[PDB]
Ligand binder design. Structure first.
Ligand SMILES: CCCCCCCS[C@@H]1O[C@H](CO)[C@@H](O)[C@H](O)[C@H]1O
Ligand SMILES: CCCCCCCS[C@@H]1O[C@H](CO)[C@@H](O)[C@H](O)[C@H]1O
Ligand SMILES: CCCCCCCS[C@@H]1O[C@H](CO)[C@@H](O)[C@H](O)[C@H]1O
Ligand SMILES: CCCCCCCS[C@@H]1O[C@H](CO)[C@@H](O)[C@H](O)[C@H]1O
Ligand SMILES: CCCCCCCS[C@@H]1O[C@H](CO)[C@@H](O)[C@H](O)[C@H]1O
Ligand SMILES: CCCCCCCS[C@@H]1O[C@H](CO)[C@@H](O)[C@H](O)[C@H]1O
Ligand SMILES: CCCCCCCS[C@@H]1O[C@H](CO)[C@@H](O)[C@H](O)[C@H]1O
Ligand SMILES: CCCCCCCS[C@@H]1O[C@H](CO)[C@@H](O)[C@H](O)[C@H]1O
Ligand SMILES: CCCCCCCS[C@@H]1O[C@H](CO)[C@@H](O)[C@H](O)[C@H]1O
Ligand SMILES: CCCCCCCS[C@@H]1O[C@H](CO)[C@@H](O)[C@H](O)[C@H]1O
Ligand SMILES: CCCCCCCS[C@@H]1O[C@H](CO)[C@@H](O)[C@H](O)[C@H]1O
Ligand SMILES: CCCCCCCS[C@@H]1O[C@H](CO)[C@@H](O)[C@H](O)[C@H]1O
Ligand SMILES: CCCCCCCS[C@@H]1O[C@H](CO)[C@@H](O)[C@H](O)[C@H]1O
Ligand SMILES: CCCCCCCS[C@@H]1O[C@H](CO)[C@@H](O)[C@H](O)[C@H]1O
Ligand SMILES: CCCCCCCS[C@@H]1O[C@H](CO)[C@@H](O)[C@H](O)[C@H]1O
Ligand SMILES: CCCCCCCS[C@@H]1O[C@H](CO)[C@@H](O)[C@H](O)[C@H]1O
Ligand SMILES: CCCCCCCS[C@@H]1O[C@H](CO)[C@@H](O)[C@H](O)[C@H]1O
Ligand SMILES: CCCCCCCS[C@@H]1O[C@H](CO)[C@@H](O)[C@H](O)[C@H]1O
Ligand SMILES: CCCCCCCS[C@@H]1O[C@H](CO)[C@@H](O)[C@H](O)[C@H]1O
Ligand SMILES: [Mn+2]
Ligand code: NA
Ligand code: NA
Ligand code: NA
Ligand code: NA
Ligand code: NA
Ligand code: NA
Ligand code: NA
Ligand code: NA
Ligand code: NA
Ligand code: NA
Lengths: 82, 182, 82, 82, 82, 82, 82, 82, 82, 82
């Protein structure tokens, strides 16, 4: 086949593989949700400080999911190989 | 499809142009890397033991000798899966039983790789046995007079945890030294 | 023959791989459900705030699951390679 | 063997890969089950709230398993590639 | 080879991969089993409640395992590709 | 490349892959075994109840192991493709 | 480069992949070992019951390791594909 | 197909694979986020020190996610092989 | 010289695979971050020792991510195969 | 196109795969770092003993990471296959 078509085919594969990164934030942020819900149940009037801390930490945990998304979007819509 | 040949026939033709030994060596290299993946297990398990050991010593510093002793003994057991994979890799590197063989190149190549694939099973025992080491260290810190009973139960359970690591080692050794396909 | 259909075939493979991301939120949100159930049993009178926190956190944990689904949808129905 | 056959072939593999997503809800929902059973033992009088909270959270954790199933089913009975 | 023999062969591969999903419920339900045994030993008089909760939650955890088997059975016995 | 041979070969591979499902129950049921041992040590007189619950829950955890085995045995001894 | 040899080659691989099932019992039984040690330490008087429960539960956790071995041994010594 | 196109294609795959590293920080930072939220709920007056410790540790956890991103970016935009 | 491109292409793949090592320190250091934040909340007076210990242990957990990075960089910028 | 190129290509990939071993020490040692930070917070007067123990155990946990690196370096710089 044309090498360009082989590049596109592999880019499709690389795009999918990059999304595997998303496994991590799913697990971690789910943990944070669980601890937050636990803490709120125990200390209802500390709820706002608890939630804020939980969300702050979750935002950080999101980043490598975004990095994966970016690499996939590059492969899909801004591919440097052609 | 690659031109007219399907990708399978294409890959076989691609591989067919090389001297069989090169193909066998190539797949051995893959088998070699794959065997080493087993090292994940002792890394997780022994690290757990390290943490439980640190915790126990903090709680009962005058018993650090007994805590550390069982931590190390139990961690030694967890190491075996990693050693076994290293041995298989070293055999495939420096005493390869496939390269000087008369049989089909496909069978020898697949067997070389398959030998390393099987050793991945070692992740299990390495992780589990290291967890057991950490609980042993923890229990001994709490009750050092029971250290003998704690050690024995830990070792019994660790032995049970080893069997699927052994089954895998046996499958690799069969592929390497008693191959039914040749 | 070659080329275009090779891209489509690999796109099928890329799409499936992209869904592996879904493993993450499944784990994380199940953990959150468990902690939420535990907290509700402990403090039934706080259950509204507990569930609210749990769901908020779970929503956040969902995103990389959706990023993955999006990439698969792109490969399937909005494929930039053909 | 036509290129169309190769697409169907890789669709069959992509479909299978899609199902790997199912590992996550299996783990997370099992965890929710365990905590729910623990909480029920500790407070049987609260079991109605505990169970409802457990099932609510588990429902959320189910979605990315469904997403994978949807992608597999698309590959199987509504394939955009042929 | 004929195009359908190739499709069949990959269908066998795709079938095997579908079953990986089964890793999830095995872990999760096992966890539920452990928590159930622990809660029963703690409070044997509440074991009816504990076990019912354990099983209901485990039933939920089973679904993505079933989803994988279905796809496998589709590839084996009701294959849309030939 | 005889089509029958390629079908049979890939059947062997898919048969092995299906067995990866076995990782799940191995982890989950081992956890169950540990909690069971812990509960019996804590309350020996309740060991009949503890064990019955441990075993019942472990049985549920076995099913996806069986599903994997079934797919492997189908590919080996009741292959629909030849 | 006969088809037979390709069947045998893929049988080797299938067999090796079947052994990955062994990861599961290794982890799970390790957990059981550690709880056993912890429990015997806490209540040496119950060690006979503790050890019996740990071994019973561990035997159950072994099965899917055995199923993988059986499949490997079938491919090795009782192959149905030739 | 030129050798260069084969290099570009494989580089796309390598770039996707590099992003798998991102699973790790997602899990770890999510754990940090939950422990931080829990600690804040327990002791709201210590929250500035808790959050600072959480973020410091999280930053350390980020680096191997950054390493993977860098390898992908190299493969994409500063590829030494062509 | 076509063969050198084959080596280069596989080196790109190998470089990405090496970065998977980064999953480990991401998880481990995130745990350290959570434990450190929890410990600081419990005993703010001890924070300098807690953090110093957290960072020392985190430095050790970093090494295998760096080993991976090094193998990647070798394959990229100091490749002995061409 | 030489058989030598095939050996080198596989060696490049195999070196990369060997580094996957590094996932394990990153997790395990990060756990150790977390437990050490926690322990120092509780008992700052035992800090020297806690840290020495943590480091001794972490040294042991490092080895399979080193085994992977050594195998990678052999495949790169002292390859017995050529
Ligand atoms: C994709 C998940 C993004 C996180 C969800 C929105 C929170 S955004 C997050 O919120 C913190 C707590 O208020 C802020 O302190 C911080 O500046 C901000 O980054
Ligand atoms: C797997 C066994 C590796 C051999 C390592 C020998 C370490 S020697 C070790 O050093 C510790 C220092 O804290 C002492 O506390 C402990 O009593 C001693 O056994
Ligand atoms: C890895 C197999 C270990 C076999 C059991 C150890 C032999 S017996 C054991 O010896 C150890 C070292 O001398 C000591 O920790 C302990 O005092 C002693 O009971
Ligand atoms: C130490 C744990 C690993 C055990 C390895 C068992 C196989 S050991 C293997 O035996 C072969 C027999 O022909 C020798 O030729 C070869 O040199 C040797 O490495
Ligand atoms: C094949 C087992 C190898 C390891 C031996 C484990 C410790 S020795 C073992 O200890 C058990 C538990 O106390 C006893 O029940 C048993 O009689 C004894 O042989
Ligand atoms: C995989 C963990 C196995 C650890 C076993 C350590 C003891 S192995 C060995 O077993 C013999 C019984 O056959 C005993 O007589 C002897 O004391 C013991 O050293
Ligand atoms: C990822 C989807 C969910 C993203 C978060 C949606 C806002 S959620 C909302 O946000 C407020 C902003 O001040 C917080 O203060 C508050 O605690 C929170 O409940
Ligand atoms: C990101 C997802 C974009 C979806 C675009 C809207 C549908 S677009 C359209 O949808 C139909 C689906 O059967 C088909 O005609 C075709 O495959 C697809 O391109
Ligand atoms: C997870 C196990 C498979 C999915 C559940 C199927 C139920 S299995 C079925 O269930 C009946 C009532 O529901 C029982 O009467 C009977 O004993 C049992 O065989
Ligand atoms: C993988 C499951 C292993 C099942 C082992 C069945 C009995 S094995 C037998 O059991 C005794 C009971 O105390 C042990 O103490 C003894 O060391 C052991 O040899
Ligand atoms: C099992 C893997 C088999 C992979 C064989 C397909 C790669 S064939 C590939 O063709 C390219 C352009 O013709 C060349 O650049 C490259 O050197 C050559 O290996
Ligand atoms: C690019 C994602 C970065 C993820 C980490 C969140 C920023 S954490 C950041 O880092 C400093 C140390 O470097 C901390 O001391 C300080 O609290 C904070 O400003
Ligand atoms: C990504 C690397 C993050 C920085 C790791 C080494 C920082 S060095 C570290 O810096 C902290 C705040 O910056 C201080 O709390 C601490 O006293 C100081 O030793
Ligand atoms: C670990 C950091 C390694 C250095 C970052 C990638 C550099 S890559 C390097 O970059 C140069 C300047 O952009 C280019 O001119 C050159 O073509 C390219 O190979
Ligand atoms: C860490 C082991 C690998 C170190 C390789 C030596 C870099 S040497 C240097 O590296 C630059 C990017 O870093 C490239 O742009 C440049 O082409 C290369 O010559
Ligand atoms: C910690 C540094 C380890 C680097 C690995 C040894 C590579 S040795 C390396 O060979 C390369 C061939 O292009 C050259 O670029 C480089 O200058 C030379 O030092
Ligand atoms: C082969 C064992 C390697 C790890 C040894 C663990 C304890 S090494 C220990 O490390 C401390 C760090 O501050 C030092 O204070 C102390 O002098 C040193 O002996
Ligand atoms: C610890 C060994 C890995 C880091 C150093 C790289 C091996 S040193 C190596 O030796 C050979 C020259 O004698 C060449 O392959 C290469 O130029 C050089 O880097
Ligand atoms: C310790 C296991 C090997 C790890 C480092 C890779 C070898 S390093 C390499 O080895 C070559 C072998 O011929 C020597 O000629 C060369 O001088 C040396 O740099
Ligand atoms: Mn035809
Ligand atoms: Na992050
Ligand atoms: Na076992
Ligand atoms: Na998210
Ligand atoms: Na979900
Ligand atoms: Na489910
Ligand atoms: Na089940
Ligand atoms: Na079982
Ligand atoms: Na890091
Ligand atoms: Na390390
Ligand atoms: Na080790």
């Amino acid at each position: 086949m044309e090498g360009l078509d082989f590049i596109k085919a592999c880019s499709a594969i690389g795009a999918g593989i990059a999304m595997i990164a998303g496994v991590g934030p799913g697990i971690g942020q789910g943990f944070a949700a669980g601890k937050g819900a636990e803490a709120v149940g125990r200390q209802p009037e500390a709820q706002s400080d608890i939630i804020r801390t939980m969300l702050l930490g979750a935002a950080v945990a999101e980043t490598t999911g975004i990095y994966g998304l970016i690499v996939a979007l590059i492969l899909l819509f801004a591919n440097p190989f052609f | 499809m690659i031109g007219d040949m399907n990708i399978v026939d294409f890959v076989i033709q691609f591989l067919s142009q090389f001297d069989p030994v090169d193909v066998i060596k190539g797949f051995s290299a893959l088998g070699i890397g794959l065997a080493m993946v087993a090292g994940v297990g002792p890394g997780i398990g022994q690290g757990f033991a390290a943490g439980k050991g640190a915790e126990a010593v903090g709680k009962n510093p005058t018993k650090s000798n007994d805590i550390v002793m069982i931590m190390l003994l139990g961690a030694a057991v967890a190491e075996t899966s990693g050693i076994f994979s290293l041995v298989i890799a070293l055999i495939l590197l420096f005493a390869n039983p496939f390269i000087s063989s008369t049989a089909s190149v496909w069978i020898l190549s697949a067997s070389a790789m398959a030998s390393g694939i099987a050793m991945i099973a070692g992740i299990g025992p390495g992780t589990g046995q290291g967890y057991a080491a950490g609980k042993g260290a923890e229990a001994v810190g709490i009750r050092p007079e029971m250290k003998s009973a704690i050690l024995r139960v830990m070792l019994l359970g660790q032995a049970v945890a080893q069997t699927t690591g052994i089954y895998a080692l046996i499958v690799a050794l069969i592929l390497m030294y008693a191959n039914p396909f040749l």
